[PDB]
From Swiss-Prot:
Name of the molecule in the record: Thermolysin
Cofactor(s) listed in the protein's UniProt record: Ca(2+); Zn(2+)
Residues the record lists as binding Ca(2+) 1: 57, 59, 61
Organism of derivation: Bacillus thermoproteolyticus
Active site: 143, 231 (proton donor)
The EC number(s) this enzyme carries: 3.4.24.27
Residues where Zn(2+) binds: 142, 146, 166
Binding locations of Ca(2+) 2: 138, 177, 185, 187, 190
Full protein stretch here: 233 to 548 of 548
Reaction(s) catalysed (UniProt annotation): Preferential cleavage: Xaa-|-Leu > Xaa-|-Phe
Length: 316
């Protein structure tokens, strides 16, 4: 839309009030012109036709309950853009400030959110298993990191490469959540998952076995469901990432943590420099060891911790 940049205010899914970048042109639209080629949020109006209508509002105040999911989708896309720009020097997901588009209110009672190859799509949840999925900043950054991966390594979505694909989205989703310092933790989707049960989440990176996911390579799922375990086997990489960052002793292997910031720099470098569409876990380990070597030297503690972590989850 062509018009004047301005700032509106509203409430997100969790009831918190925030300012959002809007555009004025007769109506106020959810169009943020301050980042790259723009961040645009659309109303899919409970249908599955995409993208829907660019979100238009008469007075620039978004406090209706129908507005909530749009406010957070729009706002957390901006935060994820900022993270990648300020921390990794990457401008949008293609690296050239591509516009970021999201539709909310997709379908009815839809207990998911996803990057479809061209834009973000968020269901509102059935209200029991989930509440509107854009209320979770780690969900938003997880799915937007699939667009980064698609433009760089290109990890195919099945078997070990898909498991790496998923782990990379959980890692940067978590790092964005720490960057915005929004009650950060190492769990995924806890702000929007089961509104009636406190303390749980979809997955855990610090202890994947809590929800039944493998935390060691000898426990990996080898059948065919979930495209060969892409959501299940990512627990092995998630546990490795958690140990590189935070340290700990895992199946008797001790790892000295080197922190979140170094974890993000090693994995971002591995992702954009060394991973390919068919990389498998062993090649991820080699990419992460080469990245840490590039940045910190082959005899650094950083390199030694990347090795211990992968040894602890059984990946050689
Ligand atoms: Ca309004
Ligand atoms: Ca959290
Ligand atoms: Ca989280
Ligand atoms: Ca819950
Ligand atoms: Zn994913």
């Amino acid at each position: 839309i062509t018009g004047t940049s301005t700032v509106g205010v509203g409430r997100g899914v969790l009831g918190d009030q925030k300012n959002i970048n809007t555009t004025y042109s007769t109506y106020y639209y959810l169009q943020d012109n301050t980042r790259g080629d723009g961040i645009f949020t659309y109303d899919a109006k409970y249908r599955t036709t995409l993208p829907g209508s660019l979100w238009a509002d008469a007075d620039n105040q978004f406090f209706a309950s129908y507005d909530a999911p749009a406010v957070d989708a729009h706002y957390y896309a901006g935060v994820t853009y900022d993270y990648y720009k300020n921390v990794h020097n990457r401008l949008s997901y293609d690296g050239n400030n591509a516009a970021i588009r999201s539709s909310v209110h997709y379908s009815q009672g839809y207990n998911n959110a996803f990057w479809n190859g061209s834009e973000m799509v968020y269901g509102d949840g059935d209200g029991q298993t989930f509440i509107p999925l854009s209320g979770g900043i780690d969900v938003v950054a997880h799915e937007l990191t699939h667009a980064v991966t698609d433009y760089t390594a290109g990890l195919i979505y099945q078997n070990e490469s898909g498991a790496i694909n998923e782990a990379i989205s959980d890692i940067f989703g978590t790092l964005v959540e720490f960057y915005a310092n929004k009650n950060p933790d190492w769990e995924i989707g806890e702000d929007v998952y089961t509104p009636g049960i406190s303390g749980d989440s979809l997955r855990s990176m610090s202890d994947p076995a809590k929800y039944g996911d493998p935390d060691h390579y000898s426990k990996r799922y080898t059948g065919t469901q979930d495209n060969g375990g892409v959501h299940i086997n990512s627990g092995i990489i998630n546990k490795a990432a958690y140990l590189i960052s935070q340290g700990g002793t895992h199946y008797g292997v001790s790892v000295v943590g080197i922190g979140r910031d170094k974890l993000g720099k090693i994995f971002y470098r591995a992702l954009t420099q060394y991973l390919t569409p068919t990389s498998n876990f062993s090649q991820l380990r080699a990419a992460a060891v080469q990245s840490a070597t590039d940045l910190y030297g082959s005899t650094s503690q950083e390199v030694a911790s990347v090795k211990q972590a992968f040894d602890a989850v059984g990946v050689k």
